[PDB]
Structures are given as structure tokens and as C-alpha cells.
């Protein structure tokens, strides 16, 4: 735990150089300000120097629960080579919880806001803009994936 607590503080230094991922971490941080969703993935450097075994134990002991888990695989197998094996190994999993322990979601609102890390010394400027998305279930995602495809992409190498 102490070693990784240094390794984590080695990659936050790295992702500063992964300039693309800095943008989305800023983007998610703004439009979803105030919610848990503005958080990073690796967490701030502060909390990583303060996190305990119990927080892991408490975090671990709540989310890894069968109703909110999945197993899947494909390629060379049959479905009943597998069902026995989770019936063998994962049957002892905690398939329940203390009645008020497993929360559901908050509707994460959307903000229209700008954020800018002005840095003139660097070569290039990574930029992003976006709006509220509908969600997973909403079927017009099949519409929007087309529209993005209409617009598309380009990076300095396509011979077109």
C-alpha cells in the first residue's frame, strides 16, 4: 500500500503530459461540478496521501456485490462450462447487504461553463467542447453516433 501510494504520485505527474486526458478531466470537472462525477479516477494527490485500509475495506465491502456485478466471456467455450464454475467459486459471494447500505444514483445535472488553463509556453493547445448527453437507454444515441460520423475525425496523416 505504501509503494503504490508512491506509484500513484508518479502517474499524476505523467498524465500532466497526457494532455488529452487532462482536458476531459477538466471537462467532466466543470459540466458536472458539485457532483461526485467531477472527480478524477486516480483521485487528488491529497487524498491518496491520506487514504486508509479501512476506506478501501469499506469501499470494497459495499460495491463488489453480486447483483451489481457481471461475468462474461466468449471465444472457445460453452455457456455451461462456465455456469458451474461461478456456481462453484462465486456462489459464496455476498449476494445481499444491510438494507440501507447499497445506494442508487443521483441525477447528475449539467452545467454550461468554461474552464481554461492558460499556458502560452507549450507547443499546442488541446481543446474540447461538449453538451449534455441523453444517457444510455435513450434510443437517439443511434442517431447521434451517425452525426458524429458525419463530422468524423482527422489527424495530420490521412492521405485524403
Amino acid at each position: 500500500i505504501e509503494k503504490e501510494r508512491d506509484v500513484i504520485l508518479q502517474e499524476l505527474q505523467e498524465n500532466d503530459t497526457s494532455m488529452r486526458d487532462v482536458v476531459f478531466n477538466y471537462l467532466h470537472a466543470t459540466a458536472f461540478q458539485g457532483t461526485p462525477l467531477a472527480q478524477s479516477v486516480e483521485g487528488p494527490s491529497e487524498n491518496v496521501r491520506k487514504l486508509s485500509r479501512a476506506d478501501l475495506t469499506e469501499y470494497l465491502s459495499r460495491h463488489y456485490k453480486a447483483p451489481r456485478m457481471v461475468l462474461a466471456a466468449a471465444g472457445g467455450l460453452e455457456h455451461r462450462q462456465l455456469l458451474d464454475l461461478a456456481q462453484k467459486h462465486f456462489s459464496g459471494l455476498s449476494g445481499t447487504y444491510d438494507e440501507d447500505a447499497v445506494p442508487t444514483l443521483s441525477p447528475c445535472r449539467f452545467t454550461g461553463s468554461q474552464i481554461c488553463h492558460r499556458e502560452d509556453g507549450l507547443p499546442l493547445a488541446h481543446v474540447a467542447i461538449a453538451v449534455e448527453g441523453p444517457g444510455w437507454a435513450h434510443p437517439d444515441n443511434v442517431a447521434l453516433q451517425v452525426a458524429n460520423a458525419i463530422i468524423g475525425h482527422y489527424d495530420c496523416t490521412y492521405g485524403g
Binding site: Q114, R118, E119
Partner: protein, 74 residues
């Protein structure tokens, strides 16, 4: 001249919000009016006293003008 080659900035961050996501006139009465006073106390001393003296030379200038037309005892 335009944006792009004016001058240098390094390691500064800007946080700005839409207008639609906020009231136009927040704390217009609450925080403003104390700020009007603080704005006022910092100017009043070196703004008025000339204009104060003007009120006196607009004062004495007319009074002393009025008398001069009134006759003398002679």
C-alpha cells in the same frame, strides 16, 4: 493587432460560467450598497472640498454683488 502574439502567460487557470446558469443581479442590494459606501469614502475627501469652496464663492460672490448695488448712506 489581435489575439495570438500579444504577450506571455504561464500556469494560470480561469473558471467562468454561463449567464443562463445564474441570476443577472445577485446581491445587488446586499453586497453592492456597502461597496458603494467603501467606494464613496475613498473618493469623497479629495473630490468635494474644491466644490465645497465653490459653493462659498458662488455664495459670497452674489451677496457681495447684491450689496454693491444698494445705495450707501450719503
Amino acid at each position: 493587432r489581435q489575439f495570438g502574439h500579444l504577450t506571455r502567460v504561464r500556469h494560470v487557470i480561469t473558471y467562468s460560467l454561463s449567464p443562463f446558469e445564474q441570476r443577472a443581479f445577485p446581491h445587488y442590494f446586499s453586497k453592492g450598497i456597502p461597496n458603494v459606501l467603501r467606494r464613496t469614502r475613498a473618493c469623497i475627501l479629495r473630490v468635494a472640498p474644491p466644490f465645497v469652496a465653490f459653493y462659498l464663492v458662488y455664495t459670497w460672490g452674489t451677496q457681495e454683488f447684491e450689496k454693491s448695488k444698494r445705495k450707501n448712506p450719503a
